[PDB]
Amino acid sequence: VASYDYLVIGGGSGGLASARRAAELGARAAVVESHKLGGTCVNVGCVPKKVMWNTAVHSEFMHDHADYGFPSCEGKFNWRVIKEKRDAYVSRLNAIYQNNLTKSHIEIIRGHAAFTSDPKPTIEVSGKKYTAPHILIATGGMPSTPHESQIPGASLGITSDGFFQLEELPGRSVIVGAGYIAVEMAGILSALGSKTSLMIRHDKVLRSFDSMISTNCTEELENAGVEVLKFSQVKEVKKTLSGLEVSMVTAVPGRLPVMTMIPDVDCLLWAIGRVPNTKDLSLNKLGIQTDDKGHIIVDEFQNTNVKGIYAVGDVCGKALLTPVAIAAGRKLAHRLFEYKEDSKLDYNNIPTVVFSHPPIGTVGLTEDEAIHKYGIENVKTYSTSFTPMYHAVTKRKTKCVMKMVCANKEEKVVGIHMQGLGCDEMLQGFAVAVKMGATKADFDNTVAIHPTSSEELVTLR
Amino acid sequence: VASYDYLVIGGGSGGLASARRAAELGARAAVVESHKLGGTCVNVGCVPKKVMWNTAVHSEFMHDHADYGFPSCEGKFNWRVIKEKRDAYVSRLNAIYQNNLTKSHIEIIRGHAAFTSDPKPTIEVSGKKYTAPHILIATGGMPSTPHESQIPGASLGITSDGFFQLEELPGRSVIVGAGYIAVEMAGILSALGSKTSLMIRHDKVLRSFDSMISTNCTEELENAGVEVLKFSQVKEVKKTLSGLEVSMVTAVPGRLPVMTMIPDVDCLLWAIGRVPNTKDLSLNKLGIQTDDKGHIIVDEFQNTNVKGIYAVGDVCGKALLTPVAIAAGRKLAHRLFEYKEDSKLDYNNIPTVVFSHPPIGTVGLTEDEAIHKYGIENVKTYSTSFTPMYHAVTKRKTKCVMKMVCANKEEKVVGIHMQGLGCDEMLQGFAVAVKMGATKADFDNTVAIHPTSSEELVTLR
Numbered sequence A, B: 001v002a003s004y005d006y007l008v009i010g011g012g013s014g015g016l017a018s019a020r021r022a023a024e025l026g027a028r029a030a031v032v033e034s035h036k037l038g039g040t041c042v043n044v045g046c047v048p049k050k051v052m053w054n055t056a057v058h059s060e061f062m063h064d065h066a067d068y069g070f071p072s073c074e075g076k077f078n079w080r081v082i083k084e085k086r087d088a089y090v091s092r093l094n095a096i097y098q099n100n101l102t103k104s105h106i107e108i109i110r111g112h113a114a115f116t117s118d119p120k121p122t123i124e125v126s127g128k129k130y131t132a133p134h135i136l137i138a139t140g141g142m143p144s145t146p147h148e149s150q151i152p153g154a155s156l157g158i159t160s161d162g163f164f165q166l167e168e169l170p171g172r173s174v175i176v177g178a179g180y181i182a183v184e185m186a187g188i189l190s191a192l193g194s195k196t197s198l199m200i201r202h203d204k205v206l207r208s209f210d211s212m213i214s215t216n217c218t219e220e221l222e223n224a225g226v227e228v229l230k231f232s233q234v235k236e237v238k239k240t241l242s243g244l245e246v247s248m249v250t251a252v253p254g255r256l257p258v259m260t261m262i263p264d265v266d267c268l269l270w271a272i273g274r275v276p277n278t279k280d281l282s283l284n285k286l287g288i289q290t291d292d293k294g295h296i297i298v299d300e301f302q303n304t305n306v307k308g309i310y311a312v313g314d315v316c317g318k319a320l321l322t323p324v325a326i327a328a329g330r331k332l333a334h335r336l337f338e339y340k341e342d343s344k345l346d347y348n349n350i351p352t353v354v355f356s357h358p359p360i361g362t363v364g365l366t367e368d369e370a371i372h373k374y375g376i377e378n379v380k381t382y383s384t385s386f387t388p389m390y391h392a393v394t395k396r397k398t399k400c401v402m403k404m405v406c407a408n409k410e411e412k413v414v415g416i417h418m419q420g421l422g423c424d425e426m427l428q429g430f431a432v433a434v435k436m437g438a439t440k441a442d443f444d445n446t447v448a449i450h451p452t453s454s455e456e457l458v459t460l461r
Ligand SMILES: Cc1cc2nc3c(=O)[nH]c(=O)nc-3n(C[C@H](O)[C@H](O)[C@H](O)COP(=O)(O)OP(=O)(O)OC[C@H]3O[C@@H](n4cnc5c(N)ncnc54)[C@H](O)[C@@H]3O)c2cc1C
Pocket: A009, A010, A011, A012, A013, A014, A015, A032, A033, A034, A035, A036, A037, A038, A039, A040, A041, A044, A045, A046, A049, A111, A112, A113, A114, A138, A139, A140, A141, A160, A181, A277, A280, A281, A312, A313, A314, A315, A319, A320, A321, A322, A323, A325, B449, B450, B451
């Protein structure tokens, strides 16, 4: 039984960040990883997604070329070219991560970990045993897929994982789900030329975002050529002579249900949710608590219910973002190895960017959330809607919407929501301001930067 | 003698902003304007510049098209197309401004104003007299040009004003000056296909910016195809059979001076400075103080040395930006018509964006300024330099540099300097944070947004 100061199960963002900070603090750490280092962010998430986004963004700007005084750009996007370059880049990252571990003197244990029956928390990887007074579970999650029992032929569809394996641009694609990943994939496939439908169970996407965003985002998708199938769901999928045929039920409220066949579908993409990767960990051998989806339950300090066992990142099922897993992993290393007992991640005011077209940036409370927290009488919002100056000369148009949610007399800024060109790079600093507890006067007292879209936020009235 | 509560001389950004806020407060105001409303920002500055920038930005992205999986884009930018669209847009703005004045019940007095000999401060416009207990001078400035006495043939060159009149893309262009306007024009002309030289008196451009920025900016220009002629200056200009011929002296220190002829120049653009527009105001009739460049001297509250006469904006020669003229004009209306005696603009921590390629964003103290203000022992900087993920797949590359200047033990953030893709939209919110007196811990305690360039600022170590 090899003993370490810190054993980290999962070599993704949370696991790596935590292991690296712990090593800086003197800890003797090892990381167990059964697949590729970098985990979701590098391999099938953040990185490859952003590259595909930058590519879709090229496609849209090329629509405006002639408007800008250039000669029309003629054609066919070549999927394999960018795919090959994207894979390469991912390979460059994997090698860098490996090198980061080595320079930090972190041991990499390759294989699939599982807890043992052993009294003192001990894991087994490939027949060998490992132990530590502090063990971090950071095994992330996976895409959720429907059961053949509920939706026959569901297994003919792919997930976001499968999207990163595609070698050609699917001719006809149907995306099922209304969350960010659904929205992002539909946007990329559509911009790149796939005839795309997005199938959602209600009337809008991103229903958990501020209502100005879910509304605007649904509209922008339609404006961009994405067919949004509202109140629809898949009843069954079948392999036809040439593609898939999707049977769906559309049940608009106040209407009779109608069944529709979607034929000649090349790509059926399920973007319905993520499941935690805890199933094969043998958690029960230690009686580690999970919820009924398989998520590991932790406290504010990432503790599980068992002493010396912690969990961070997607496995915990809260705020499923790469920077969150990193920050929580880091704070945990300081608490464990630097004895900072108050060391923990504040889960409020975490900013998010959704890489739609145009991108979405959000931080803090939606209007309804502030209304429930402070009372209608105590919530004041300011918002603007305009066409960015970039489109002053284009036939194609997109809008920019911004909303600021203030609370109490002081008008504390408790939420910022926006969609528009440049919103992906604009959010960070306002997120800093919101974290510091800025009020509307703080924004109003900052001189604007002209001409930009960002200046709208400091001149709201 | 028609009497008003407030008379504003100059219908540009500062003048309009001040008149409009005053009118909201009940004041009976009139604006005197001798040319087009909107002044510099609308007509020959901010707006038309940004449109040309967006156009140059198209040109650069089109270089990356093939890298991104698309077929090569072939050609010739057509200047007149964009020029015509740009002029139109400017016409749309002028009509909007006019409408804004009318809806506010502000009277527009068309013509050229000048002070009278009259005891109580009185102006004359087209033979009629006007007076008010509060008169605002907001006449802006103009491009500076060399005297034929010092540089013979200087009048064969144009200024930024003339740039907005060009109808064709000049084949060969030489820009003289090292400030932002010089930098911006060289960048647009070069991106659009003009064979461009930038002639500077020293070794770097933007010498008043943080040294990381002047260095990086000079390099990016060279990398983009701009020829930077260092330690050079124009000795004379002459009209040859086909274009202009520019005689310049190059005097590198530690070297002998060398004289060079630049032939076949289509466009010679002077971007050497701005002069205040005060010359024809008859200031001396009231004994209003000016400096030796013709700038109106004011105090912290925009007062001149004469009671009931104020000045804001470019005419004052400090922080020559559209948002500054607006903010100072607005603060002044609140002080005069809302009786807020402490109402004034804080000239510290004003953010600036330079629309180069890539754009530059800056706020607060440069490293040298903080060193002089707090002492070397009390200044700590953090900086990063990386290649944005956008170029992971391109042959063409640009860099992103960021520098944070902290002061004292607390590490108060006293300056932020950056150059890079997305930096134009990224600055605003950090400017809010810096204005509120954030420290490095405030930044460090804000969760990052991944994957973005902006997140680099919250993860500096
Ligand atoms: C398509 C997509 C796009 C996304 N885009 C973004 C984005 O733009 N921005 C953002 O912030 N977030 C984004 N996310 C979410 C973000 O990627 C995740 O929140 C983050 O990667 C979770 O990190 P983690 O460390 O919890 O898990 P992971 O990075 O998944 O790490 C888990 C690791 O543990 C390994 N493992 C699992 N079980 C075991 C075991 N028993 N033994 C050994 N090793 C094991 C797995 O192989 C894996 O490498 C995206 C996600 C997806 C799917």
